[PDB]
């Protein structure tokens, strides 16, 4: 397995079994040493204040978050960021249906859009009550992050002169979203509570509630 | 006046899965050192030790059946027991139904067995050396 790259002669098959045995002993000791280290007790790359939640946003009850949010922060979110799995994938409608009006009273949005669903995002979040404002453009090849705002950002909380909209890849030929955007937020809201939907373990930064099926 | 270190634990208790935060509320870094879907919960290590008494060392297929409802990895059982028996090769122990209290003795006796002959690594006695 694969059946065609495998040997069929006895001399070829015995030789291969002999080398696999040696190799299982090798990856055995690497797995004992891995588990023991993890066991007693290694530290992950995750910051301590991060707040992961593995759930499916269709199945997830947002009210459980809403209530536990008010219970602890005393306020709804300041900044919400998204990277919808456009159509592993979610029907364009499903994400549209998500109750993101409930989730934030006054603050910003950040939605990542590919050229194919660029227009869709605008009317997706104008539905969410957000007012389209600004576009952050990422150069790797282009991907656009659309920004919106509802209610009042007049408060001193937010900082109007946020960092320069353009942004670059931290590495060359990279596919994960770049970290700088988490400091754009940090200039825009320092130590503000933030939500990320469609998050990923490498999107785990502290101060951030991250919801993702892959967390 | 919003304490984020307390706000983090206070959220993790009410929203995060049982695997992500300790009832303490702090973060369970053991969970992120293993890929998503291949983490080994403690409710799984007790499920295995239990399987050794009812089905013995060799019958992984039968154990995965009763304790893990057919969802666990036969080879991850095959290895996690080596760590229970502190030995790299468990061919000797094939088919022996071993009580949970006999396992620690078998581990301690194989660790100490390992320690003496300097054939011990990573709390595991390597009776097979390549």
């Amino acid at each position: 397995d694969y059946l065609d790259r495998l040997p069929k002669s006895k001399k070829g098959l015995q030789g291969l079994l002999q080398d696999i045995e040696k190799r299982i002993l090798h990856y055995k000791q690497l797995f004992f040493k891995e588990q023991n280290e993890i066991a007693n007790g290694k530290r992950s790359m995750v910051p301590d204040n991060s707040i992961p939640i593995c759930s499916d946003v269709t199945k997830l009850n947002f009210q459980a978050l809403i209530d536990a949010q008010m219970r602890h922060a005393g306020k709804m979110f300041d900044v919400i960021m998204m990277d919808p799995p456009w159509q592993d994938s979610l029907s364009d409608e499903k994400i549209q249906n998500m109750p993101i009006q409930s989730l934030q009273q006054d603050g910003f949005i950040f939605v990542w859009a590919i050229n194919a669903k660029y227009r869709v995002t605008i009317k997706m979040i104008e539905n969410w009550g957000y007012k389209l404002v600004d576009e952050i453009t990422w150069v790797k090849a282009k991907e656009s992050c659309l920004i919106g705002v509802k209610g009042d950002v007049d408060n001193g909380r937010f900082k109007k002169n946020i960092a320069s909209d353009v942004i670059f890849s931290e590495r060359r030929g990279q596919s994960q979203k770049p970290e700088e955007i988490y400091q754009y937020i940090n200039q825009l809201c320092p130590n503000g509570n933030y939500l990320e939907i469609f998050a990923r373990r490498n999107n785990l930064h502290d101060n951030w509630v991250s919801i993702g099926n892959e967390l | 006046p919003l304490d984020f270190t307390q706000y983090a634990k206070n959220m993790r208790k009410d929203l995060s899965n049982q695997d992500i935060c300790l009832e303490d509320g702090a973060l369970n870094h053991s969970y992120f050192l293993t890929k998503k879907g291949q983490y080994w919960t403690p409710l799984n290590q007790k499920a295995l030790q239990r399987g050794i008494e009812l089905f013995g060392v060799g019958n992984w297929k039968e154990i995965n059946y009763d304790e893990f409802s057919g969802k666990a990895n036969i080879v991850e059982l095959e290895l996690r027991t080596c760590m229970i028996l502190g030995i790299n090769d468990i061919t000797e122990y094939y088919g022996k139904k071993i009580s949970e209290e006999e396992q620690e003795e078998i581990k301690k006796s194989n660790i100490a067995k390992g320690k003496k002959e300097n054939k011990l690594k990573d709390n595991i006695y390597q009776k097979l050396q390549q």
Partner: peptide, 25 residues
């Protein structure tokens, strides 16, 4: 990139297939 577990899984499954062809003879 693979993990240590995933590699051991391929290795065991491979071992089973070859042991099957070694027995088929």
């Amino acid at each position: 990139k693979f993990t240590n577990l995933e590699i051991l899984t391929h290795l065991y499954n491979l071992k089973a297939e070859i042991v099957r062809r070694l027995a088929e003879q």
